[PDB]
């Protein structure tokens, strides 16, 4: 769960 | 000197008082939904865009995952969840999964550049390129060669807490 989808 | 443009910033981002730094906050600020504001992706642009010439700026980077920065074409989509890819008009380096990347597509390009502290960005709108250098020795990190067809803005994105980006002048 890095959040990179929202970069 | 470059500053971050608060009217473009995703409302979850927190900008420093001097408008040089950005990190991701834990709560969405109650901000007006301007058409230029990124409403889903964790992005902010500088207030200055460039249509011609050659330009430098420097970006201090956090040591941990969560950031990407570089340039975006002005027409970069602001609304809804969008891909973070050259096709969407973003040309960027990224720290994710403990690895530095040039954000090429469909697969990112892992960089064997060693630890980064501050990066110089060189934008050339005359020839059509954006290049990244690690400032300690100006070693080349990556160059995107692009026939830019509109204004280009410095781009910053921070998608998790625990890292930051800072314009350094």
From Swiss-Prot, chain B:
Belongs to the TRIM/RBCC family. This is E3 ubiquitin-protein ligase TRIM7. The lineage of its organism: Eukaryota, Metazoa, Chordata, Craniata, Vertebrata. It comes from the Eukaryota. The B30.2 domain mediates interaction with GYG1. The coiled-coil region mediates homodimerization and heterodimerization. Forms homodimers. Interacts with GNIP2. Interacts with GYG1. Interacts with RNF187 (via C-terminus). Changing residue 84 to A: Complete loss of substrate binding. Changing residue 94 to A: Complete loss of substrate binding. Changing residue 157 to A: Complete loss of interaction with GYG1. It comes from Homo sapiens (Human). Auto-ubiquitinates via 'Lys-63'-linked polyubiquitination. Skeletal muscle and placenta, at lower levels in heart, brain and pancreas. Isoform 1 is widely expressed with high level in testis, kidney and heart. E3 ubiquitin-protein ligase that have both tumor-promoting and tumor-suppressing activities and functions in several biological processes including innate immunity, regulation of ferroptosis as well as cell proliferation and migration. Acts as an antiviral effector against multiple viruses by targeting specific viral proteins for ubiquitination and degradation including norovirus NTPase protein or SARS-CoV-2 NSP5 and NSP8 proteins. (Microbial infection) Promotes Zika virus replication by mediating envelope protein E ubiquitination.
């Amino acid at each position: 769960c890095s959040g990179v989808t929202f970069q | 000197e470059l500053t971050l443009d608060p009217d473009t910033a995703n409302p979850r981002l927190i900008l420093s008082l001097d408008l040089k730094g950005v990190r991701l906050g834990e709560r969405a600020q109650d901000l007006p939904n301007h058409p230029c504001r990124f409403d889903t992706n964790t992005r902010v642009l500088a207030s200055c865009g460039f249509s011609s010439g050659r330009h430098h700026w420097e970006v201090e980077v956090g040591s941990k995952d969560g950031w990407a920065f570089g340039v975006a074409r002005e027409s970069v989509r602001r609304k809804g969840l969008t891909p973070f890819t050259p096709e969407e008009g973003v040309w960027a380096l990224q720290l994710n999964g403990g690895q530095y990347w040039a954000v090429t597509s469909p697969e990112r390009s892992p960089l064997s550049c060693g630890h980064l502290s501050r990066v110089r960005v060189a934008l050339d709108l005359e020839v059509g390129a954006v290049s990244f250098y690690a400032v300690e020795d100006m070693r080349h990190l990556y160059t995107f060669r692009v026939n830019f067809q509109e204004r280009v803005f410095p781009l910053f994105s921070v998608c998790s807490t625990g890292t930051y980006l800072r314009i350094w002048p």
